[PDB]
Amino acid sequence: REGRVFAPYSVFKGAAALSAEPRLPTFNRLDSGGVKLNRRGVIMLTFWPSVGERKYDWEKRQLFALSATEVGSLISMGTRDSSEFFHDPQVRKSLSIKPNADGSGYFISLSVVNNNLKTNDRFTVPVTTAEFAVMRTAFSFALPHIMGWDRFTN
Amino acid sequence: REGRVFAPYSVFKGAAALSAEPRLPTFNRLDSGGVKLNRRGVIMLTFWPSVGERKYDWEKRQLFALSATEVGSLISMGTRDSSEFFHDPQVRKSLSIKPNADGSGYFISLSVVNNNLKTNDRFTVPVTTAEFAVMRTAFSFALPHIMGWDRFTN
Amino acid sequence: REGRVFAPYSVFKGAAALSAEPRLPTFNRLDSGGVKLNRRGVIMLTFWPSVGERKYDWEKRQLFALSATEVGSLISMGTRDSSEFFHDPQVRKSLSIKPNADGSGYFISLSVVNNNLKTNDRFTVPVTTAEFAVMRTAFSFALPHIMGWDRFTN
Amino acid sequence: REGRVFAPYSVFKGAAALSAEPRLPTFNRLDSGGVKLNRRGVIMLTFWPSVGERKYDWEKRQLFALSATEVGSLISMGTRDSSEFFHDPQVRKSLSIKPNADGSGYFISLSVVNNNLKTNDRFTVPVTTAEFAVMRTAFSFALPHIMGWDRFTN
Numbered sequence: 001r002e003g004r005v006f007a008p009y010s011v012f013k014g015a016a017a018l019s020a021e022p023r024l025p026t027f028n029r030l031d032s033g034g035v036k037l038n039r040r041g042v043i044m045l046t047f048w049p050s051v052g053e054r055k056y057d058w059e060k061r062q063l064f065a066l067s068a069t070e071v072g073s074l075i076s077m078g079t080r081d082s083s084e085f086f087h088d089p090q091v092r093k094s095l096s097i098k099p100n101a102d103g104s105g106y107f108i109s110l111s112v113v114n115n116n117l118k119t120n121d122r123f124t125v126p127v128t129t130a131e132f133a134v135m136r137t138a139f140s141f142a143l144p145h146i147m148g149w150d151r152f153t154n
Numbered sequence: 155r156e157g158r159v160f161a162p163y164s165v166f167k168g169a170a171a172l173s174a175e176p177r178l179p180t181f182n183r184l185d186s187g188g189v190k191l192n193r194r195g196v197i198m199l200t201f202w203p204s205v206g207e208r209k210y211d212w213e214k215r216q217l218f219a220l221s222a223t224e225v226g227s228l229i230s231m232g233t234r235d236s237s238e239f240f241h242d243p244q245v246r247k248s249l250s251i252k253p254n255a256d257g258s259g260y261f262i263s264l265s266v267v268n269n270n271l272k273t274n275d276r277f278t279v280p281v282t283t284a285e286f287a288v289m290r291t292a293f294s295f296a297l298p299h300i301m302g303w304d305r306f307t308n
Numbered sequence: 309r310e311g312r313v314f315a316p317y318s319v320f321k322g323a324a325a326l327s328a329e330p331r332l333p334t335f336n337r338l339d340s341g342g343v344k345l346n347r348r349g350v351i352m353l354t355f356w357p358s359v360g361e362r363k364y365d366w367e368k369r370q371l372f373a374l375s376a377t378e379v380g381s382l383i384s385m386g387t388r389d390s391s392e393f394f395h396d397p398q399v400r401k402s403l404s405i406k407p408n409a410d411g412s413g414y415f416i417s418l419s420v421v422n423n424n425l426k427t428n429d430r431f432t433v434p435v436t437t438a439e440f441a442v443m444r445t446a447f448s449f450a451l452p453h454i455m456g457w458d459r460f461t462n
Numbered sequence: 463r464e465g466r467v468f469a470p471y472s473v474f475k476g477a478a479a480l481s482a483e484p485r486l487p488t489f490n491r492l493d494s495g496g497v498k499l500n501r502r503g504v505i506m507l508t509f510w511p512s513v514g515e516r517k518y519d520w521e522k523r524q525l526f527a528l529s530a531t532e533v534g535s536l537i538s539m540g541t542r543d544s545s546e547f548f549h550d551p552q553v554r555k556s557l558s559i560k561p562n563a564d565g566s567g568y569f570i571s572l573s574v575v576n577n578n579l580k581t582n583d584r585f586t587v588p589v590t591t592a593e594f595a596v597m598r599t600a601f602s603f604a605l606p607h608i609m610g611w612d613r614f615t616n
Contacts, residue, residue: 343466
């Protein structure tokens with residue numbers, strides 16, 4: 001617990017909020033010496049809905065984890081590019097990132113569907129060019145770290 | 155005080171000078187273990203006016219702090235892009251960055267207005283493409299640091 | 309052996325798999341003080357063939373080392389760019405990276421030829437834009453490290 | 463002397479060779495605590511002439527130091543961009559970087575003139591796109607370091 005860090009980048013908007021934070025990979029120590037990557041690193045996204053003016057319901061939050069490759073998708077997006085990721089379970093989630101009309105930003109939307117319970121939720125947060133540039137730059141910085149490549153240093 | 159660092163990037167021009175330097179975020183240590191970001195990091199800009207040939211008046215300086223998102227705005231600017239940031243108080247400040255005619259650089263201008271005292275100041279510094287490229291590269295380097303994301307490392 | 313790190317980025321596809329990992333340079337310590345780069349750093353690529361559905365034959369793997377300059381070639385590639393590297397021995401190897409039809413990714417192909425033994429092998433792995441973006445970002449991160457330039461720090 | 467590092471990036475060509483290496487800034491420690499940048503950092507270029515097939519004369523080398531701003535110029539260069547830097551003394555030096563005909567690389571040329579002694583030297587090294595990409599990526603990595611901004615970290 002001593003090694004925990006909390007420093008999300010968060011964007012609060014009218015209908016919902018979104019936060020992003022890296023999760024580092026885990027490594028296994030080898031008997032013969034050295035380490036080897038174990039559990040993958042991700043960039044974790046958290047979405048939660050507004051319930052009023054500048055008020056949000058943290059209890060209804062839903063998460064979506066971006067793999068290294070999914071981060072690669074996001075950082076290579078141009079002004080007018082779109083993408084969608086589908087994660088299989090019961091509950092199915094999908095994350096879409098689509099440009100706004102003006103190319104002055106995007107809509108980032110998390111869909112959460114439980115067909116069995118007929119429950120259906122969607123959390124959408126607009127992000128400006130400036131905000132998405134923070135995401136690209138920060139996620140690009142984090143990528144080598146979530147891949148474990150920061151361990152290759154002189 | 156032992157941890158202070160002074161290493162501004164500065165540009166000195168005919169009517170004014172400008173300097174830029176990161177300010178790191180502060181963190182709070184958690185009782186249960188780990189840390190959490192407290193006070194935001196910024197890139198601090200300082201402007202001061204010329205009073206003669208290669209002479210400037212440091213006593214009349216005025217500051218403007220760039221948030222992570224405002225840095226995102228600056229680093230994603232193309233050759234012909236413009237931007238303006240407004241900071242509310244009494245005294246109101248605004249920062250504009252506009253391309254020059256030739257697309258060989260920009261004008262970075264700080265406006266400081268105190269309507270009550272009818273005082274009105276403006277400090278403008280031209281910056282070349284090369285100088286703005288230093289800013290983009292350096293501010294991009296600093297961004298993960300002012301966000302606290304440098305704490306996520308293996 | 310205590311300093312070994314294993315954290316490849318790997319892409320598994322229908323006919324073959326590919327993995328990439330940096331190899332750091334070696335340095336020599338100088339009698340008068342300080343260090344000087346000795347053996348070059350590279351980004352090592354490993355290719356091996358499929359033998360069935362999600363099954364591959366590690367025993368038939370073949371390697372190809374990218375120099376700093378060859379990494380420079382890869383990271384500066386645009387969507388529609390191609391490249392080929394030839395490495396002299398007996399056995400000759402060549403590595404090609406060519407865009408797919410749609411510009412939605414590339415084919416990375418390792419050729420291994422032994423004219424004397426008339427043996428002839430080729431291992432080809434398709435990589436998406438997102439996967440190649442991971443490679444560009446990660447290899448760019450690693451470049452200063454494999455060059456030894458990470459040693460120039462305050 | 464214990465802190466010296468030697469790890470140039472070097473390009474050897476038909477008529478001349480060129481090497482590049484960062485030089486870190488110096489800092490002064492403050493009585494009240496903390497440090498402040500003193501002597502500027504640069505990227506140092508070294509050129510020397512060929513005297514035969516894969517043979518060069520190190521004794522006739524000439525140097526040229528790139529300031530942070532001059533590095534900004536280099537890293538922001540597009541395929542078809544040119545630049546020239548002039549350094550005043552006695553001896554005057556100028557450094558030009560011009561694209562080749564095909565946009566497949568550049569010519570980097572150091573001029574050294576001593577009008578008084580009527581001595582006149584020029585050392586020119588062609589650099590491929592891949593080689594210049596190493597320079598851009600490596601110099602961009604080094605820039606925050608030569609500016610002293612690597613000292614702003616959590």
